[PDB]
Design a binder for this molecule. Sequence first.
Ligand SMILES: Nc1nc2c(ncn2[C@@H]2O[C@H](COP(=O)(O)OP(=O)(O)OP(=O)(O)O)[C@@H](O)[C@H]2O)c(=O)[nH]1
Lengths: 50, 50, 49, 49, 81, 292
Amino acid sequence: LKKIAESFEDPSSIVVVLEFILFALFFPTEFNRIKGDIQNVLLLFFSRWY
Amino acid sequence: TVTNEFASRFRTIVATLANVVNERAVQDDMQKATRSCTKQWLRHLETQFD
Amino acid sequence: QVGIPKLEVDHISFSNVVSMMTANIRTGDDMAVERVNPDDVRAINIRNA
Amino acid sequence: PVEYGIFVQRGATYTINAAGEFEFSGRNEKWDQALYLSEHFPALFSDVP
Amino acid sequence: IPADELIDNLHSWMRSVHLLHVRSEDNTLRYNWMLGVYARSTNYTTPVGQLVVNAPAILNYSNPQDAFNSVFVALGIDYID
Amino acid sequence: MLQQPTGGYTTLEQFAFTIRNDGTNATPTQFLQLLSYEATENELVKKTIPTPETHLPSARNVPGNVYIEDAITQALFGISAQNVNAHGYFSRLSALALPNTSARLGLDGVIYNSETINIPFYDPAAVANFAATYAKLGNASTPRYRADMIDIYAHVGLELAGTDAERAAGVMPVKRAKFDSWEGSLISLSRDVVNWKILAFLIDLCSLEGEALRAFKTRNRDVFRMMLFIMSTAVAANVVNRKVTKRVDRVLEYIGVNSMRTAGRTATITYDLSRHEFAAKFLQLTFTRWNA
Ligand SMILES: Nc1nc2c(ncn2[C@@H]2O[C@H](COP(=O)(O)OP(=O)(O)OP(=O)(O)O)[C@@H](O)[C@H]2O)c(=O)[nH]1
């Protein structure tokens, strides 16, 4: 993954989450390759939001 | 003839993300604003996708 | 038997096995990085342990 | 300042539960007009002594 | 100090405090009073504080150790002073 | 493949363990005779060593042939080793843990992913018994599996300094080791030990059973004790020399007490925190195998 630094303080940070979802829809394969590296970002998103 | 399963799926996704954003507690007033705007932007994303 | 260390005895030795690095290993080179600044200064957490 | 500290320790906002009681936020925060369509109210206007 | 004044003052003060929390139906929970008080004392500026603010429900716990583990893992911190 | 003898692999001359001493290749046992002790008022009481975790860390998909013996010995004995858990190659032992794996542990101490020509290697069954325990070096640093790095040293002292009576008792006075010494003795002892083919020792320790294992444990007790001595000097709070009428007596205080020091010193090898975590884990596993 081309790494994203994102704290997820602002609600707008949801954009990044959507950026992944779209990528997982448009490109399930390439996503499946980069997806753990995506999980590293998502874990920040969850620890902050949930 | 009318329904596009892809677009409908993105509708449920954006609906979920919107209720996720809606439920997001925020401290600053500006965050409260971005929280309300993000939902509109989500709605826009949904139409663009459809 | 293990070999006697060359530094243990007083004899001089003129064939030795010097380890060295090939062109593949490199050290002391400058290193490129992508720094990414915090999105908002007011959101930075100075505090928690 | 002191009346303000008491007031704002009760909280800047409130909601009205199904019982009709005002539950104050207990939390200092600025209002935004977003909240105008929310369940929240500015607390200054509660008229609750 | 006259008792009436100590009482009126302590009463007004106690009424002034309002710990953040989520109410819940489950019988097994305890509010994590220490962390909620500490988040209040720092006006929820510390990362534990803003944690308490966005997720007040994190103070509820059934197992006493997880009351702190959930906070340490949400925060990535090794400790809290 | 080198078949393991009825005794250990250590019975073979190919794996003699010897420290250079007085101009000769002394056996470790005859070095330990030089060792002498001064009891202090303080006491070591050996506690039960906690049972090692069942979890073998997953070997990562590593294309290369890891030099495992070198990593282990340098972590326990190396003068300059540091950050031994950052690279994290000890997990690789777990590759050998599987029944019918293509991996081989060469006598070189390398972990080939496939059997390869003109490289002698240990019998895969014995290596499997070995790896089934020692792969757990691969989680020496992961917090859930970290070994106690304080209490375990008591056992070190007991197996090193301990008289047979003190060992039966399970408690001994905290002693202070000493021996007549040449210049840079402890460094040279540590380098003579880092060159040891200790995989033979550990493989035999894990693979042997019954009378063979017991005979191994007696025949090789002083080897183990030498490793314990290098390790202990790495954790000794201080290491002085004493004049003694035109002779110098090296003195390390104290045996069986990890001072947790990480500052380097000329006298002996030093454990960084990671080296401590590793040695602690190693001693946990090895002492577990040593008693059965
Ligand atoms: N701020 C704050 N400190 C606490 C809280 N709970 C416990 N402590 C502190 O934690 C420390 C450790 O507990 P102890 O000192 O062993 O217990 P103690 O309160 O002195 O009670 P005893 O030991 O039985 O006399 C104490 O110094 C307490 O003051 C809390 O909810 N808020």
